[PDB]
Structures are given as C-alpha cells and as structure tokens.
Symmetry: D2
Subunit: 396 residues, 4 copies
C-alpha cells in the first residue's frame, strides 16, 4: 500500500442523522447526498466542484429513488455533467466500500479528484407489490416492506439481522445488562459530544423551506432520546423472555448522508490544497452470513496490515454499532479497550442510515482524532450477508 | 495503464437472454447471476471456485431482490463465504463498470482472483407503493412501475429512454427508415450467428425443473424478426412523426454474464491459460438526456488509456440501447458498421440492463475468435448521461 | 294474512348466462350484466314499456369499485327512466331473492305498480383492498385484501371461509366426500341434460361481446361442460387436507351473472291486459347460528310455505341453492324433501353462483322447471353467509 | 295498513374524518347506536327484535353483510333478519322505510332500522391484480371517491354537481357562506344548551396500555367554525369563480344512527310508550347531476302520501349535502329557513353518508320535542339523482 500512490482526504461532511419518519423524512436520498457533497466541497480552499471527476456513492434501499442514485447526488450537488457516477451496495458497508473504490480510482491514475460516500433515506423506502405483472387470480397478497427485504433481512436464512445479533450475544456470552450498559455509555458519549459542540464542524445543517416557517435541522435526532430507566425496563425486540437485544440497545432506522473529497498527490500540489488526512490502507473480509456481527474482527487486522500499522498504534477506532453487542464482541475478539472506541458515541445513539454509515463513521473519526489530538484512526463496519469493511487514516 | 499490474480474463460465460415475462422469468436475478458465475469458473482448468476472493456484480433494478444481489450471486454459485461482494449500479453500464472495478482491485494488489459481471431480471422487477408509511388521507394513489422508475426514466426530465432515443435521431439526423434497416441488419447478424453455432460456447444453457424439464439454450429475441411488420409498425414514443419503434429498440430482458479475472502472478502460479488481456478502459458522461452518444467520449478515452489507435480495433461492441444509438456513435467516431456488433446486438439479442455491459464483452471475445481478430473494444451508454468502454486483446 | 294485501304477479324473468371466474363474461361489469337481464326480462312483456317501471331493487354483494348505487347503474343501463327509484340490496347470497321480496312489498304497500327486482355479481371484477393507506403503517409487511374473500365468502364472526363451514355442515349431518361427490355428478348431469335439451334457451338472454369485426356471443352457462367424474372423485379436498369432504368440484364456483324479474300489481295486470307467468304466494326469511347458515333454508322454507298457506307435499319443484353439495344434501334430509323434486335442471354447483344474483337466478330457473315438468307450485330457498336464508313460493299460471 | 310507531332512537356522535371515531368500524358504530336505542325502551327486550335494515354505502372491507354485524354486535339474536341497503346518501332513511313496510305487510312486529358509515376506514382498491398489468404505472382507487362521492354517469364529484346547483338557481359564494355560518351557530348553540344530549349515546374508547380512557360525547365538527377563515378560504371545486368550499360543504364523517319500530298490536301488547308515528314517505329521482334538487320531489310526495300539508310542518330536516342544497330546496318548496335544521345541519354536524338519513330523523325528533312541535319532515338527497323523504308526528 506504500508502493501505491498516496490518496489524501481534503474534507468531509455529513447531514445531521434524522430519525425514522422524523426531521429529514421529507428529503430523498439524493437530496441528502447532494447536501453532504456540496458541504464537503465548500470546505476545500482552492478546489472547485467543477474539478470533481468521479463519484462513488453508497445506497442500499434504492427502490423508487430513480436512475443511479449516485448520479442524482452528484448533479444535485452542482457537479459537472461530465462526472462519472456509480452507486455502490455492500449493505451497511456501502459508504465505506465507496470510499475504497474512490481511492483505488486515484491510485490507478483514472482520476485525480473523487467524491465518495453514501446516503440512505429509510423514511422513503417504499413497499413492493411483486406479482402485479403476471397477476394473482385469487387470495390475499403481501405488500413487501423494502427496508425489511432489501436492508435488514439476511438473504440466506430469511432472518432479520437482529436475530443474528441475538446469535452473537449467545455465541460470545453478552447479557442483556452488558448490552444495555454499553448502550447507555454510547448515548452519554454522543450527548456529551453534542453538548460540547464536537459535531459542529462535521455536520452541515439542513434548511427546510416552509410550504409556513422554515425549519433548520442542526443536530442528530436520536441522542436526546436516552432514558436509562426505560432502556433497562423495555422488552426484548426479537426473542421474548430470554432476549437480550432491544430497540434502545440496537441501531435505529435513520435518514442521512456523508461525503469525503479525495485527491491525488499531484493535484494536492498543483492546487496547493491543505490535506486533512491520508488514507493509509483498507481491508474487506467476510464469513458465515449469520456471523456478520464479528466480520470486523477480520477486516480490521486486514486493513491494519494493508496500512503497515500495528493495532496498538491506533489512537481511535470507529466500530460501527449496528447493535451494542457488535461493538462488545469485536472489542473482545480484537482486544480493543472501549476507551479507544466510538469516542463521540456511535450508531446506537447517533443513528444508522445504512447506505451512509460507512462514510458517516469516517467523518466522525476525523472529528474524534482532531478533538482528542490523535494521529492514527481505524473505522470498521460490518454488513448484512457476512461482510465487513475497514479503513485506516492518518490525520495530518 | 501499462505501468500497472496486468489483468487477464481466464474465462467468461453468459445465460441465454430471455424475453420480458418469457423463457427465464421464473428465475431471480441472483439465480441468473449464480448460473453465469458457475459456468465461467467451470471453463478454467486449474482454478477452483474457492480461489475467487472478490466479486463485483452489476444490477440496476434491485428492489425485492434482497440484501446485496452480488453476494447472493456469489454464494449461489458456490463461492466461499470469505468472498468479498459488492453490487454495482451505473444503470445500463453496470456490468462493465463492475469488470473495471474488478480489474482495479487486482491492480492495487487487494485480490489475485476476481469474478465480475452483472445480472438483471426485468420480469421480476416489482411495482412500488411509495407513501404507505406516512399515509395519504384522500385521493387516488399510484403504483410505480419499478422498471420505468429505476431503469428507464431520466431523473431530470422524467422522460422514458425512448424519448432520449428520439432526441438522438433529431440531433444526428437518422430517419425512421435508417433506424429500421439498421435493426433488420442486426437481427440478420444475430440469427446467422445463432444458426452457425457461434453463441454455443459463450452461452451456458439453463435447465428448468419440470411436466418434464425445459432447457433454455437460445436467446429468445432474435427469432422474432419480421421485416414487413417491422417496417410497418407505428412509432412507439412520438405518434406520427416518431422514428423509434419497439422493433428497432432494445427490448426488456432477463439474463446475466460473468468474467473471471486473474493477476499475472496468479496466472503463473496456477499455470492458467488466459483468454484475453485487459488493455484499458474509460468512463465518460455528458448531458443526461444525451446519454445515447456518451460512448463517443468513452471509447476514445478507453483507447487512449489502452495505448491503442481506433483503426487497430478489429471488432467493436457498441451496445444497441436503440438502433439510433449505434448509428449515432458510428457516425460520430467514424467507425464502419462492418466492424460493429458482428454477431448482432441488443436490439436483436436483448438488453437485461444490469448485465449487458458484461454480456457484450463475452460476445466480443467470441467475435474476435470467430473473425480472427486480436483487439476489441466494448462501449455501452447508460441512463443518466454516462458511458463505459473497455479494450481487450485476444490471446 | 297475505290475502288482506294486494296481489303481486311475475310477468317475466330473464338471466344472463353464468360465466366462470375470469371467464366468458369477465369483461363485463356487474351493472352491465344487470342491465342486460333487466332489458331482456322487460322485452318479454307484451304491453309493458320500460318507462312503466317505477322502482328497482337489485342485489349485489361485492360492490367495491362498482361505483355509486349498483342498482341505479343497472336501471339506467337498461334504459329505465331517470325517475326510477333504485336501491341496492346486500343479504350476501340471498341478495337476489330479498330484493324480489322488497319489490313485492313495495307494491303491497301501494307505493308502486311496476317493479323490477333481481341481482347481479361480477366476481371477476371484485378488487383487492389496501385497507390502511389513509393513516399509514410505519413499518412491516402489509396486506392486500381479496375483496371476494373478505366481503363475499368469509363469516365475519369466526373469520373463516364458508367452505370450512360447509365442512362443518358435513360433520353435523353425516354426509361423506363420496356422498357429496355423487350429488355433484348428478346435478352436473341434470345441468348438462337441460342444456342439451334447450331447456335453458328461454330463460337465458345471450350476450354479444363487440369485436374489432364480428361479435363473440356467449350463449351457454360456462361451468356445466367442465364435469369430469374421474377427476372429480380423485381431486384433493379443498379446505381440510386428507380428511376433507368439501372440494372445488362439489362446491359452487366463483361466477359472473345476473337475473331479473318484473312484478306488477293486479290493477296494472288488467289495466295493461298482461299475461301473468306466476303469482307470488308468500316468502320467508330466517336466520340462525352464523357458521350453520348451511341449514338455514330448513327454517326459511317452512316459514315461506306457511306464509303462503301451502303444504310441502303440494310443491311440484324446489330450487335449493347449491352453495355446496352438502348444503343441498343436508336441507333435503332435514326437511324430508326427495332429490327427485330438487334442482331438476341442475343447481349452482354445476351452473355457477354469482352470489348477489343467485337468489333471482334460481327463481328464473324455477319458473322454467315448472313449465318444463308441468307443475304449478314451486319453492326457491337460498342460504347466505352470516347464518341466514330466504325462500319464496310461486304459483305458475 | 297497520300503523308503525317509533319507540326510540339513538345516534353516535358524528366523528370527523380520521378523527375521534376513526378507530371504530362501521358495524361497531352501528351496533353502538342499535343497543343504545333499545336501552331507551323499557319493556322491550333486544331478543324481541325480529328484523334489521341498515344503510351502508362504502361497504368495501367491512365484511359480510354490514347490517348483520351491526345486529349481532348490538346483542340481537342470531335469529334476526338482517339486510344492508345502499341508496347512497339516502340509505339510512330508505332502510327505515323498508322496515316500516316490513311491519305493514305483517312480516315483523319489532324492527331496528338505520344506517352506519365509517368513511375513515374506507379502503383503497387495486382493481387489476387478478389479470395483471404487464408494464406501466397503475392506480389505487380511493373508495370514498369511487363508491361514495362520484356520480357514475358523469364521473364528477358531488361538489361539481353542487356548483351546478348554484348556477342553476342563483346562489353565490357569500349566500352559501352565510348559510354555513348560520347552521354552524345553530349547531354550537344546541351543543351548549344540551339539546343533543338525549339523542347522542356517548362512546367509550378505553386505553389499557397505560393510556387513559377517552369518552366521545360531542359532535366533532360544529366547534371548528371560524368565520374569518371561512369567508377567506379558496373555492374547492372551481378555482376563482366557484361557490362551493370545504367549510360550506358537509365533511366526510363517521357515525351511525338507529330507530326502533313496532307494530300497532305490539305497542299495545307490551304496553310501550311511542315517541312518534310514521305518517308517510316518498322516494323520487331525476337527472343524476340534478340530485341536489331531488328533495323538491320526494318531500311533496311524502307529504301527499301522508295526508299532511307543507304549511302544517313544524320543523324540516333537509339534509345539507352542501349549503347550496338547503338553499335551493328551500327556494323551490318555499320553506322559510326559520323552520329548517333548528339544531344545525350536516354542513356543521357532519355527513356519514350511509347514516345521515337516520341521523337527521333522530335529530328531527329532538327538534320537535325542544321546539314543542307536532309534525316533522325529513328529506335527504342522494348521489345518482334520487331523494328520500319521511313524515312523522310526535306523540
Ligand atoms: Cl457480505
Ligand atoms: Cl451517468
Ligand atoms: Cl344472516
Ligand atoms: Cl338515485
Ligand atoms: K471549494
Ligand atoms: K459545519
Ligand atoms: K438505539
Ligand atoms: K475450474
Ligand atoms: K492448469
Ligand atoms: K457453452
Ligand atoms: K427489438
Ligand atoms: K316489452
Ligand atoms: K331467450
Ligand atoms: K363445482
Ligand atoms: K330494553
Ligand atoms: K343519551
Ligand atoms: K364544513
């Protein structure tokens, strides 16, 4: 990875993360993505939106978004019609795999300026009617919830990912109480970062014009919802009685987008750009689909080896909190202390727009490294179907 | 491009292309994709399915296919659960961009064996109900056709691709008659290739469990040519003065196609015999309603990346989204039809949109062998304004 | 009694062919079928104009997406004056017969002199329902509800199909799969024999379907020809696998069709010098436990006979609507009515069961059976989902 | 013919569209009104009711025979004869007429008749799933528009027929707004004076997930009057020049109402005290789009069938399908508004179409009691060109 051309991150930006049918539910996935792309580019002194050559953008539940969500994000952000645009689906890892592909396109010399990231509007995922073309002569028919079908259900076993999270808790010995106390801790971290202004730089607030007064959405919607007594008292979500996974200690359904701007070494010099960070390496891994929860335990070492960096040298990790048990299990398998993980809180408290989260956690990681005066960061995100993606950055 | 690691195609395969609601409509997109991947790997002596490290697979209309169509394609083909899988959507160019991404992943050293391609089941694209979560208190509502919404409608103009085809005919001066005679010629070429056995190698027949079992061996569309009916049919998108018709356009279709890519080091380690070498590629884009002529940008870009002159190409595959698309790109690039789509194109063969980018590459490798060519170029336009192109050398 | 009230005569009747589900008449809406039967029945009355019709009662069960007031649509479609009073009637399977009863009563209270009554059903064009689109449903798969199942064939109380309750009737009164299959065969044969002899030609009004250029004509009922005894005795049970006795071939099908009768008061009959086909002697509705609707005609039939002052032995022909073969079997046993006097030209198991129309359909057929077999007194009885039944006694003139 | 007596009557509160009663189905509302009216009759058991006629227009997804569900939910015997009647907006009154006829022909001694409608729970329709639609966007039909508010011949909503009525007889946006404001204030004054308390049976909606219990006692619509907002709201059906608006029209509503009828002989046998006696009725019809003025035919028909003069009626309930409907009918019959809808009308109270025919008859008896009157008449127009009218004498 050192024998390959350098890839610099010159900026990043994210929408606030809205709740399901909540503050951003009126916006489509390309509207969210355009907002993030435009806000990331506005931060780069000396780089124009017309300089962007290629876009990779993650998006999972693309039904009814229209042709090529990434293209719609790029044009909506004001990029040139000459821009090459590709939508990426690696379920929950989409937004990070998009960034990997953008880096590679710089490395093979086919671009010098790339925007990559991801977007998801789970609020605007439709329902499906699958048999209208051939007809169904007689009998009740099903309207398929696109979130469940294309976002949250493992294709092999037809099992919701929350059921496989329960499998993870049983496999690795994590109780209801260990998961709940993790969830409270990560909500408290997200609230603390919010209150301290530590998301202000990375978030681009959204202005919703009134149809009626305008509305400005500035903060992530979920963190303020923590109620520790109710969190500890709620019923399980997937297994009655003996269940350990709950709605409060799991990720929610959410709307949001995030974007990074990548440039080659040559373009960084030509335009005299100030780099925020360097991409040191990455790794994808996969295992049995129902064990997707611990695929980051393969991807993270793979990315660290690609980067030539030891695990102990990392100053901060972003382990995406698909569920509280996912963070607990990868911390246990890798031997990573929680005091190095999701220092501004994670998806259980912040939200999980699935096509965007892989880029969202990288944006947040750069903020964590700056706030905590760190240098080396690693983001790792599991995905439905058994996979995970991971990436190592150096703050400059 | 020549200063980066070499990428070899060690095999390729495709399903037959089925008609809309036709011979393959009982199969899902991952079932077609798995079939193509498995058939491509079976052709490589000395390479096991367990050697495949990563998959990139195109798919456009992914609604109701379930999580990660490419992952389902990979597992259904018998690949290991360790395999990295990413689904790609660049509309009609998805299958070719997937192959580009696979090649890049070998070039950056992150894989030595990659399967890439694409799949589409347009038969099984659903309809959508968009406002059931928040409700709609009063008034008639709509069920959105997923093919129209996510496959065939330009987002900015909200116009179907046939109307962009008419823009192409007006912008580059191709009449109804010119488009029809082009369409007849490409159906004739596809039928001739069919009868001469020239698709037998690339196609992996599909066995449908039975009633007794049905085997689908042929592409469904080529036989439908009726020249008298084609010249007489009413235009499909503009009454009276229109030039684009259903016969002279690509149809809606089902199918998949796959290539197997290896690094130079792995080729030597496993003593594999390569079919072709990837020489270069290029993506380009312009005004979305003008996507029809984006190949006139992408093809020269791919040739420059490959370090190959246009005159040295022995055969081109220019995807026939419409007959007028091939006519316009041939005119703009100065490519004679005698070098284009030598076994016919998508107007006659079919156009499963997420697969066609890989489908035309598989067919191109067959054309280079049959016609004793060495250098080939595939170029495919895509809704939204883009095109992708790729240059190969037959070994 | 009835004799203290004005007389009510039937001067004509007519019915469409009964089409199969998604079959020969699937292109026609329920009011198109109803208008066709109304026009045909009126064309048969010498001396009576369509403008003479004052009020219409018409049955229709699955009215979803039919539009405002199906009976008004049937009446205006048939060329009746816009001054016509029109009411649609839903007593599920009994709708067509209760409409005729309400029509008779409206003459008897002196509010009309010429009434057209009947029923119609297009089960092919029954839609699916999206029940919760107004308020939304935030998350989860949802249901598209089959309107035939919901509004036509499911008991509201137990929320179970009528077939499963036909299965319950079989266990209650001791009728086997073989006993139901052998009945089904016999009524299919009576239906085929009646078709072959042309005994349906008078009552049926053939339907023309416009072509490009010539016209397709539906002249025959669609279901009778489908009898296959080998397949019938060998088919899997429809509701209870293994031990079930109710099957699709021995049950009534889903069907499209309509039927109509014209009623006049005694004054109009002589004021217009009309030849009356039959006189309405009495009628009777009854109801019991919803899941036991199958034997409800066993209450309604004797109640109708009593209202009409007529004995059960005096009846020359019975029409007992064959919702299921066991429905006809059980009511024959309960009342002690021999099959030799029941559904002599076949019943709904072979002819079809367009549910809103069948109560009028069996009356039209009953009039034809009395003419053919040279009887004078007839009784039609039809059960309906929910526990009820309706019955009517006529005298052929 | 035998005399027919009203021994009681009851109605639910009239809920707003998707409002205070939206959680209840049409049979639950109907059962509530039936058993409430039967509770008012001392000496008459619910087991004494032999037959039920209940109006209901938009019956889709209500289940088998709405009237039967109303009867059984109200505690009536399974032996009860139950028929659902649809004469659109006149269903609730035509049901009552059919029940009186069933007593007059001596087939019943105790009949419950009325109407119910849950417009909140009217579904949308998918009409072509059985045969399918191969390619194209499709429609979901709003059952309220299709089966309730659209004339079948002209395919136009009732509001456009109301604009016809305005240009037919000369009633401006200001005249209709003035009437709407007047009927709203008569409704609000009756609420404050308790004049709806006897007829309305409140509904208990208990929440037991920790939620608190909710009792609906008031009609939801009368309080919504805002004359400033009303006068300045844009037209509803004809932009700029129309005269019909949502405030001056009836809303969409949920509600039910029932009457208990008995024969002359049963009144004497059970020693019951009759509230009123049905004197006569009349149905009439004309051009479907001119249904607005159809009460101008049925109201005289009902007065003549009953042997009562128009100058002899103490109070009229002319159902306000639109404010212009009341104004037009008053003009053609020459009826002073000081004898019309003395507690308000459907423009302010609400219009559950299948129930309103019984609802206005219930409110009429409360008018005749409060105003100390003897003869009341109720007329109600219905879609399709018809109207129903009924004449009562308070006892
Ligand atoms: Cl995966
Ligand atoms: Cl594009
Ligand atoms: Cl019943
Ligand atoms: Cl009418
Ligand atoms: K900038
Ligand atoms: K900011
Ligand atoms: K949570
Ligand atoms: K092999
Ligand atoms: K080998
Ligand atoms: K082959
Ligand atoms: K074609
Ligand atoms: K005649
Ligand atoms: K005939
Ligand atoms: K049958
Ligand atoms: K009582
Ligand atoms: K009360
Ligand atoms: K109002």
């Amino acid at each position: 990875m050192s024998s390959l051309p350098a890839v610099y991150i010159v900026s990043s930006a994210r929408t606030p993360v809205g709740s399901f049918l909540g503050s951003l539910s009126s916006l489509t996935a390309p509207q969210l993505g355009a907002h993030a792309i435009k806000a990331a580019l506005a931060k780069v002194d000396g780089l124009k939106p017309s300089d962007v050559q290629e876009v990779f953008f993650g998006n999972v539940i693309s039904a009814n978004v229209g042709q090529n969500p990434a293209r719609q994000c790029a044009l909506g952000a004001g990029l040139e019609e000459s821009t090459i645009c590709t939508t990426v689906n690696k379920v929950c890892a989409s937004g990070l795999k998009a960034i990997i592909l953008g880096a590679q396109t710089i490395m093979t010399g086919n671009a010098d300026v790339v925007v990559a990231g991801g977007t998801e509007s789970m609020s605007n995922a439709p329902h499906y009617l699958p048999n209208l073309r051939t007809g169904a002569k007689y009998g009740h028919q099903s309207l398929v919830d696109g979130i469940m079908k294309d976002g949250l259900t493992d294709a092999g076993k037809q099992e919701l990912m929350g059921l496989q999270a329960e499998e993870c808790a049983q496999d690795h010995g994590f109780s209801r109480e260990q998961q709940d106390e993790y969830a409270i801790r990560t909500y408290e971290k997200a609230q603390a970062a919010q209150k301290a202004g530590l998301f202000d730089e990375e978030i681009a607030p959204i202005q919703l014009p009134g149809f009626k007064p305008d509305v400005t959405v500035t903060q992530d919607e979920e963190p303020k919802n923590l109620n520790p007594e109710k969190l500890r008292a709620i019923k399980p979500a997937f297994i009655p009685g003996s269940g350990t996974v709950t709605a409060p200690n799991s990720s929610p359904l959410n709307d949001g987008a995030a974007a990074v701007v990548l440039v080659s070494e040559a373009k960084l010099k030509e335009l005299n750009l100030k780099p925020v960070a360097k991409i040191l390496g990455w790794g994808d891994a996969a295992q049995q689909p129902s064990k997707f929860t611990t695929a980051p335990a393969l991807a993270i070492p793979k990315a660290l080896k690609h980067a030539g960096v030891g695990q102990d040298a990392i100053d901060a990790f972003e382990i995406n909190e698909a569920f509280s048990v996912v963070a607990l299990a990868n911390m246990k398998l890798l031997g990573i202390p929680e005091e190095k993980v999701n220092l501004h809180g994670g998806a259980v408290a912040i939200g999980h727009p699935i096509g965007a989260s892989g880029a969202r956690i990288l944006t947040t990681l750069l903020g964590v490294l700056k706030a905590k005066k760190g240098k080396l960061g690693c983001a790792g995100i599991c995905n439905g179907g058994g996979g995970a993606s991971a990436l190592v950055v150096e703050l400059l």
